[PDB]
Coordinates of C-alpha atoms and ligand atoms in Angstrom, one line a residue:
Chain E
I1 CA 17.1 -23.9 58.3
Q2 CA 17.4 -22.5 55.1
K3 CA 20.2 -20.2 53.6
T4 CA 20.3 -18.6 50.2
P5 CA 24.0 -19.2 48.2
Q6 CA 26.8 -16.5 48.4
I7 CA 27.8 -17.3 44.4
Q8 CA 31.6 -15.8 43.8
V9 CA 33.3 -15.8 40.6
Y10 CA 36.8 -15.5 40.0
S11 CA 40.7 -16.6 38.1
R12 CA 43.7 -17.4 39.8
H13 CA 46.0 -15.0 38.0
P14 CA 44.9 -11.7 36.8
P15 CA 43.6 -12.4 33.1
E16 CA 45.7 -12.1 30.2
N17 CA 44.3 -13.1 26.7
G18 CA 46.3 -15.9 25.0
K19 CA 48.0 -16.9 29.1
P20 CA 46.6 -20.7 30.9
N21 CA 44.9 -19.6 33.8
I22 CA 42.0 -21.3 36.3
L23 CA 38.1 -20.0 36.7
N24 CA 36.8 -20.3 39.7
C25 CA 33.3 -20.4 41.3
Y26 CA 33.1 -21.0 45.0
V27 CA 29.1 -21.4 46.5
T28 CA 28.9 -20.5 50.4
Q29 CA 26.8 -19.9 53.1
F30 CA 23.9 -22.4 52.0
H31 CA 21.6 -25.0 53.2
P32 CA 19.9 -27.3 52.8
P33 CA 22.8 -29.0 51.1
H34 CA 21.3 -30.5 47.5
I35 CA 22.7 -27.8 45.0
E36 CA 23.3 -27.8 41.2
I37 CA 26.0 -25.6 40.4
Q38 CA 27.2 -25.3 36.3
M39 CA 30.1 -23.6 35.0
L40 CA 29.4 -21.6 31.5
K41 CA 31.5 -20.7 28.6
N42 CA 29.6 -18.3 26.2
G43 CA 26.4 -19.9 27.3
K44 CA 27.3 -23.2 26.8
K45 CA 28.0 -25.9 30.2
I46 CA 31.8 -26.3 29.9
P47 CA 32.4 -30.2 30.4
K48 CA 34.5 -32.0 33.0
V49 CA 34.4 -29.3 35.4
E50 CA 36.3 -30.1 39.1
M51 CA 34.1 -30.1 42.3
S52 CA 36.1 -29.5 45.2
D53 CA 36.8 -28.1 48.5
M54 CA 33.5 -28.8 50.1
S55 CA 33.3 -27.9 54.0
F56 CA 30.9 -26.4 56.6
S57 CA 31.1 -23.5 58.8
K58 CA 30.6 -22.6 62.4
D59 CA 26.7 -22.4 62.0
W60 CA 26.7 -25.5 60.0
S61 CA 26.2 -23.8 56.2
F62 CA 27.6 -25.7 53.4
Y63 CA 30.9 -24.4 51.3
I64 CA 32.0 -25.9 47.5
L65 CA 34.2 -25.1 45.1
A66 CA 34.1 -25.4 41.2
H67 CA 37.0 -25.1 38.9
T68 CA 38.7 -25.2 35.5
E69 CA 41.4 -24.6 33.3
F70 CA 41.2 -21.9 30.7
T71 CA 43.2 -19.6 28.6
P72 CA 40.9 -15.9 28.5
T73 CA 40.5 -14.2 25.2
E74 CA 39.1 -10.7 23.9
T75 CA 35.7 -12.3 23.1
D76 CA 34.9 -15.0 25.2
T77 CA 32.4 -14.7 28.6
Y78 CA 32.3 -17.1 31.4
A79 CA 29.6 -17.5 34.2
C80 CA 28.1 -20.0 36.9
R81 CA 24.5 -20.5 37.1
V82 CA 23.3 -22.1 40.7
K83 CA 20.0 -24.0 41.3
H84 CA 19.1 -24.2 45.1
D85 CA 15.5 -24.5 46.9
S86 CA 16.1 -21.1 49.0
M87 CA 15.7 -19.2 45.0
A88 CA 12.5 -19.6 43.1
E89 CA 14.9 -18.9 40.2
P90 CA 18.1 -19.9 39.2
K91 CA 21.0 -17.2 39.9
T92 CA 23.7 -16.7 37.3
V93 CA 26.9 -14.8 38.1
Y94 CA 29.3 -13.3 35.4
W95 CA 32.6 -13.2 35.9
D96 CA 34.1 -9.6 36.1
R97 CA 37.5 -9.3 34.7
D98 CA 38.0 -5.9 35.5
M99 CA 36.9 -6.5 39.4
Chain M
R1 CA 42.9 -41.7 58.9
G2 CA 39.2 -41.6 59.7
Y3 CA 37.2 -42.8 62.3
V4 CA 34.3 -45.4 62.4
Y5 CA 31.1 -43.6 64.0
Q6 CA 29.0 -44.6 66.5
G7 CA 24.9 -45.1 65.7
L8 CA 22.7 -42.1 67.0
Chain N
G1 CA 53.0 -23.5 63.7
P2 CA 49.9 -25.5 64.8
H3 CA 48.2 -27.8 62.0
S4 CA 45.4 -29.8 61.8
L5 CA 43.5 -33.3 60.6
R6 CA 39.2 -32.6 60.1
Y7 CA 36.7 -34.9 58.8
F8 CA 33.8 -33.2 57.3
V9 CA 30.8 -36.1 56.7
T10 CA 27.2 -35.7 55.7
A11 CA 24.6 -37.6 54.9
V12 CA 21.5 -36.6 53.2
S13 CA 18.3 -38.3 52.5
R14 CA 16.1 -38.1 49.1
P15 CA 12.9 -39.9 49.6
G16 CA 11.5 -41.1 46.4
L17 CA 15.2 -41.1 44.7
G18 CA 17.1 -43.8 46.8
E19 CA 19.4 -43.9 49.3
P20 CA 20.7 -41.0 51.4
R21 CA 24.1 -39.6 49.4
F22 CA 26.8 -40.1 51.8
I23 CA 29.9 -38.0 51.6
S24 CA 33.2 -37.6 53.5
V25 CA 36.0 -35.5 52.7
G26 CA 39.3 -34.9 55.0
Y27 CA 41.8 -31.9 55.5
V28 CA 45.2 -31.6 56.7
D29 CA 45.3 -27.7 57.3
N30 CA 43.0 -26.0 54.8
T31 CA 43.7 -28.3 52.1
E32 CA 41.9 -31.4 51.0
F33 CA 43.5 -34.9 51.3
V34 CA 40.9 -37.5 50.9
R35 CA 37.3 -37.8 50.0
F36 CA 34.6 -40.5 49.5
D37 CA 31.4 -40.1 48.0
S38 CA 28.4 -42.1 47.9
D39 CA 27.7 -41.3 44.3
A40 CA 30.6 -42.5 42.7
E41 CA 30.1 -45.2 40.0
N42 CA 31.9 -47.7 42.2
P43 CA 32.5 -45.5 45.9
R44 CA 35.8 -45.9 47.3
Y45 CA 38.3 -43.2 49.6
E46 CA 40.9 -41.4 46.9
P47 CA 43.6 -39.4 47.1
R48 CA 43.4 -35.5 46.6
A49 CA 46.3 -34.6 47.7
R50 CA 49.6 -35.8 45.6
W51 CA 51.8 -36.5 48.5
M52 CA 49.1 -39.3 49.2
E53 CA 50.6 -41.5 46.5
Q54 CA 52.7 -42.8 49.7
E55 CA 50.6 -44.5 51.2
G56 CA 50.2 -48.3 49.8
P57 CA 46.9 -50.4 48.8
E58 CA 46.0 -51.5 52.1
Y59 CA 45.8 -47.8 53.2
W60 CA 42.6 -46.9 50.3
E61 CA 41.3 -50.5 51.1
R62 CA 40.7 -50.0 54.7
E63 CA 39.5 -46.4 54.4
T64 CA 37.0 -47.6 51.7
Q65 CA 35.9 -50.3 53.7
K66 CA 35.2 -47.8 56.8
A67 CA 33.5 -45.3 54.8
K68 CA 31.4 -48.1 53.2
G69 CA 30.5 -49.2 57.0
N70 CA 29.8 -45.3 57.9
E71 CA 27.6 -45.0 55.1
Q72 CA 25.5 -47.7 56.5
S73 CA 25.3 -46.7 60.0
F74 CA 24.5 -43.0 58.8
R75 CA 21.6 -43.8 56.7
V76 CA 19.9 -46.2 59.9
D77 CA 20.6 -42.7 61.7
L78 CA 18.3 -40.7 59.4
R79 CA 15.7 -43.3 60.1
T80 CA 16.6 -43.3 63.7
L81 CA 16.0 -39.5 63.8
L82 CA 12.4 -39.2 62.2
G83 CA 11.4 -41.4 65.3
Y84 CA 12.9 -39.1 67.5
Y85 CA 11.4 -36.1 66.0
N86 CA 8.0 -37.5 64.9
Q87 CA 8.8 -36.8 61.6
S88 CA 7.3 -38.1 58.0
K89 CA 9.8 -40.3 55.7
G90 CA 8.8 -37.7 52.9
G91 CA 11.4 -35.0 53.5
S92 CA 14.5 -34.7 53.0
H93 CA 17.1 -34.1 56.4
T94 CA 20.6 -33.6 56.7
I95 CA 23.3 -35.1 59.7
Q96 CA 26.5 -33.5 59.4
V97 CA 29.4 -34.1 61.9
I98 CA 33.2 -32.3 62.1
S99 CA 35.5 -34.8 63.3
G100 CA 39.5 -33.7 64.2
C101 CA 42.5 -32.9 66.2
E102 CA 45.0 -30.1 66.4
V103 CA 48.5 -30.3 67.3
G104 CA 51.6 -27.6 67.5
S105 CA 54.5 -26.9 65.9
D106 CA 56.3 -29.6 68.1
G107 CA 53.6 -32.4 67.1
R108 CA 51.9 -32.3 70.4
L109 CA 48.0 -32.7 70.9
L110 CA 46.5 -29.1 70.8
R111 CA 42.7 -30.2 71.5
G112 CA 40.3 -32.5 69.8
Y113 CA 36.7 -32.6 68.5
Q114 CA 33.3 -33.9 67.3
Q115 CA 30.5 -32.3 67.1
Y116 CA 26.8 -33.1 65.3
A117 CA 24.1 -31.4 63.9
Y118 CA 20.3 -32.4 62.5
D119 CA 19.5 -30.4 59.8
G120 CA 21.9 -27.3 60.0
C121 CA 21.2 -27.0 63.9
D122 CA 23.2 -28.4 66.9
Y123 CA 22.5 -32.0 67.8
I124 CA 25.2 -33.2 69.9
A125 CA 28.9 -32.9 70.6
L126 CA 31.9 -34.3 73.0
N127 CA 33.0 -31.7 75.3
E128 CA 36.9 -29.8 75.6
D129 CA 37.6 -32.4 78.5
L130 CA 37.2 -35.2 75.9
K131 CA 35.1 -37.0 78.7
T132 CA 31.4 -36.0 78.6
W133 CA 29.0 -34.8 76.1
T134 CA 26.3 -31.9 75.9
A135 CA 23.2 -32.1 74.0
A136 CA 21.4 -29.4 72.1
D137 CA 17.5 -31.1 72.9
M138 CA 15.8 -33.9 74.4
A139 CA 16.4 -36.0 71.1
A140 CA 20.1 -35.7 71.5
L141 CA 19.6 -36.6 75.0
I142 CA 18.5 -40.4 74.2
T143 CA 21.7 -40.6 71.7
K144 CA 23.9 -38.8 75.1
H145 CA 22.4 -42.0 77.0
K146 CA 23.2 -44.3 74.7
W147 CA 26.6 -43.4 74.1
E148 CA 27.2 -43.4 77.6
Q149 CA 26.2 -46.7 78.6
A150 CA 28.0 -48.1 75.2
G151 CA 31.6 -46.5 76.5
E152 CA 31.4 -44.1 73.4
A153 CA 33.3 -41.2 74.9
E154 CA 36.5 -43.4 75.7
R155 CA 36.8 -44.9 72.3
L156 CA 36.7 -41.3 70.8
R157 CA 39.2 -40.1 72.8
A158 CA 41.8 -42.8 72.4
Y159 CA 41.3 -42.1 68.9
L160 CA 41.2 -38.4 69.0
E161 CA 44.6 -38.5 71.3
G162 CA 45.8 -41.5 69.4
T163 CA 45.4 -42.6 65.8
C164 CA 44.4 -38.8 64.8
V165 CA 47.8 -37.4 65.9
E166 CA 49.7 -39.6 65.1
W167 CA 48.5 -40.1 61.4
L168 CA 48.3 -36.1 61.3
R169 CA 51.9 -36.4 61.9
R170 CA 52.9 -38.5 59.4
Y171 CA 51.1 -36.7 56.7
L172 CA 52.8 -33.2 57.3
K173 CA 56.1 -35.4 57.0
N174 CA 55.0 -37.1 53.7
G175 CA 53.4 -34.0 52.3
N176 CA 56.2 -31.5 54.0
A177 CA 56.9 -29.8 50.2
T178 CA 53.5 -29.2 50.3
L179 CA 52.0 -28.6 53.7
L180 CA 55.0 -26.7 55.3
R181 CA 55.7 -24.1 52.4
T182 CA 55.0 -20.3 52.2
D183 CA 53.5 -18.9 49.0
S184 CA 54.0 -14.8 49.8
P185 CA 50.8 -12.9 48.2
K186 CA 50.8 -10.7 45.2
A187 CA 49.0 -7.7 45.7
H188 CA 47.2 -5.0 43.8
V189 CA 44.8 -2.4 43.7
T190 CA 41.6 -1.6 41.2
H191 CA 39.4 1.7 41.3
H192 CA 36.0 1.9 40.3
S193 CA 34.1 4.9 40.1
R194 CA 30.3 5.5 42.0
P195 CA 27.8 8.1 41.8
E196 CA 27.8 11.5 44.1
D197 CA 31.5 12.1 43.8
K198 CA 32.5 8.5 45.5
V199 CA 35.2 5.9 44.9
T200 CA 35.5 2.3 45.4
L201 CA 39.0 1.0 46.3
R202 CA 39.4 -2.8 46.4
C203 CA 42.6 -4.5 47.7
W204 CA 43.6 -7.9 46.1
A205 CA 46.1 -10.6 47.7
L206 CA 46.4 -13.4 45.5
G207 CA 48.5 -16.9 45.2
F208 CA 49.4 -17.3 49.0
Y209 CA 50.0 -20.3 51.2
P210 CA 49.0 -21.0 53.8
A211 CA 45.6 -19.5 53.9
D212 CA 45.5 -17.4 57.2
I213 CA 46.2 -14.1 56.4
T214 CA 44.8 -9.9 57.2
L215 CA 44.0 -7.1 54.9
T216 CA 43.4 -3.9 56.3
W217 CA 42.6 -0.1 54.7
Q218 CA 43.8 2.6 56.6
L219 CA 43.6 6.4 56.9
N220 CA 45.5 9.0 58.7
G221 CA 47.2 5.8 60.6
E222 CA 43.8 4.3 61.8
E223 CA 42.4 1.3 60.6
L224 CA 38.8 1.4 58.6
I225 CA 37.8 -2.0 59.9
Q226 CA 34.4 -0.4 60.9
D227 CA 33.7 0.9 57.1
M228 CA 35.6 -2.2 54.7
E229 CA 33.5 -4.8 53.0
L230 CA 35.3 -8.0 52.4
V231 CA 35.0 -11.9 51.4
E232 CA 36.3 -15.0 53.2
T233 CA 39.5 -16.0 52.1
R234 CA 39.2 -18.6 49.0
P235 CA 40.5 -21.3 47.3
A236 CA 41.6 -20.4 44.0
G237 CA 41.7 -24.1 42.7
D238 CA 45.3 -24.9 42.3
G239 CA 46.2 -25.2 46.5
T240 CA 46.6 -21.1 46.9
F241 CA 44.5 -18.8 48.2
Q242 CA 43.0 -15.2 47.8
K243 CA 40.9 -12.3 49.1
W244 CA 39.8 -8.9 48.6
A245 CA 39.1 -6.0 50.6
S246 CA 37.4 -2.7 49.9
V247 CA 36.3 0.9 51.1
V248 CA 34.2 3.7 49.5
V249 CA 36.6 7.3 49.5
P250 CA 35.5 10.7 48.3
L251 CA 36.7 10.8 44.8
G252 CA 40.0 13.2 45.1
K253 CA 41.3 11.6 48.3
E254 CA 42.7 8.4 46.8
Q255 CA 45.8 8.9 47.9
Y256 CA 45.1 9.3 51.8
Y257 CA 44.3 5.8 52.0
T258 CA 46.3 2.6 51.8
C259 CA 45.8 -1.0 52.0
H260 CA 48.1 -3.5 54.1
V261 CA 48.6 -7.2 54.0
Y262 CA 49.8 -9.4 56.6
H263 CA 51.0 -13.2 55.5
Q264 CA 53.5 -15.3 57.0
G265 CA 55.5 -15.1 53.8
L266 CA 55.9 -11.2 54.3
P267 CA 58.7 -10.5 56.5
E268 CA 57.0 -6.7 56.4
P269 CA 53.7 -6.2 56.0
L270 CA 52.8 -4.6 52.1
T271 CA 51.9 -1.0 52.1
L272 CA 50.0 -0.6 48.9
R273 CA 47.9 2.7 47.4
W274 CA 45.9 3.7 44.4
Ligands
LIG301 C1 60.6 -32.9 52.7 O1 61.6 -34.1 53.4 C2 62.5 -34.5 52.7 C3 62.8 -35.4 53.6 O2 61.6 -36.6 54.4 C4 61.8 -37.6 52.6 O3 62.1 -39.1 53.3 C5 61.0 -39.3 54.5 C6 61.2 -38.6 55.4 C7 59.7 -39.5 53.2 O4 58.9 -38.6 53.9 C8 59.7 -38.8 52.1 O5 58.7 -38.9 51.2 C9 60.8 -37.7 51.7 O6 61.2 -37.1 50.7 C10 63.5 -33.4 52.6 O7 64.3 -34.2 51.6 C11 65.7 -34.8 52.2 O8 66.4 -33.4 52.6 C12 67.8 -33.8 52.7 C13 68.3 -32.2 53.2 O9 69.1 -32.6 54.5 C14 68.8 -34.8 52.2 O10 69.9 -35.1 52.8 C15 67.8 -36.3 52.0 O11 68.4 -37.0 50.9 C16 66.2 -35.5 51.2 N1 66.0 -37.1 51.4 C17 65.3 -37.5 50.2 C18 64.0 -37.3 49.6 O12 66.0 -38.3 49.7 C19 63.2 -32.5 51.8 O13 64.5 -31.3 51.8 C20 61.6 -31.6 52.2 N2 61.3 -30.6 51.4 C21 61.2 -29.4 52.1 C22 62.0 -28.5 51.0 O14 61.0 -28.9 53.2
NAG302 C1 3.4 -36.9 65.9 O1 2.8 -36.2 64.8 C2 1.4 -36.5 64.1 C3 1.2 -35.4 63.2 O2 2.2 -35.9 62.0 C4 0.3 -36.1 65.4 O3 -0.9 -36.3 65.1 C5 1.3 -37.0 67.1 O4 0.3 -36.3 68.1 C6 2.7 -36.6 67.1 N1 3.4 -37.5 68.1 C7 4.0 -37.1 69.3 C8 5.1 -37.3 69.4 O5 3.7 -35.8 70.2

């Protein structure tokens, strides 16, 4: 079976400039398992991102989390880029701090 | 602790 | 309340790129505590929760040896299924397994399970009686027959009722400060304009533990569960969880709607309005 991933980007705490936080990219409901997930800061790959919380649901689709510590500023932007077989083009989801 | 799985 | 010990295992082949990738991740309730990944420099079972520092080196050596054994068994399994299904060695395939046990607040067994899937579809599973198997197709029926001749159901049941239960209790005891805690949700509502004189109201619930929670929107005392939009509860990167739920209301009557948050860390549910 083939299922396109749902990509969700969010921080641990409501964003406040100058205060330590955690940025998350949760990729879910996908199949097959092969996947590439990258977190980006101002268009550049963030080094040493932590991958965790891999599991599957009752219908066997995969779930996994990518996260990193960060301190937001008024100018910095963040996003999550994903490559999977269900999509011809890579998909990027941007962090919307006013969501 | 984990299990030692049986072959299919 | 009740607690669980679960292991999610997967093996995925990659023709032309070497051996299949094998990963095993263990969870106590909804938090990761151990993991083994064959793509690591020097594959070893590793702790993923701080309280696992309480196990000695013998624990890690034994879990690692079993994981390496499982890695090789699943590698063979991938080949076997190519035969059962008459498939070629050129494509990638996936085997998935979920194993676990759940106990009540008193530590006694409530249920046990072990279910397999091949390429995202049910393959074989242990029935609730913990004595018989149910097979989804004729290939799994071959596996069923092998397992019955080998006395597999008896071995597995012994594990689920014994080992699984005993170690889950031990983990709950060692990591009590983490596993038996309660972090109350912090909520707030955001507002977003839309065309046609309508507005999107979104209710957020943050920093809570455990993961179970209920978020609803109300109007005139009724529950708008039918019109709501939401996401599955998700991990926030520090051991806590997050969730949101929204509804579209006409501009001007936002004060008529309310968000309700129910969680064990909330003696009385929260009620919010924009
Ligand atoms: C979590 O449980 C501990 C008791 O368990 C301690 O000893 C072993 C069981 C082992 O698992 C070890 O890791 C763990 O720390 C509670 O601590 C105890 O609290 C009582 C209070 O009556 C004290 O009298 C004990 O001295 C103290 N034990 C220790 C650590 O010396 C701890 O309170 C509890 N945490 C919470 C808040 O739930
Ligand atoms: C297996 O597949 C081949 C084609 O790939 C086909 O010719 C053959 O009949 C199949 N055998 C079975 C198990 O029916």
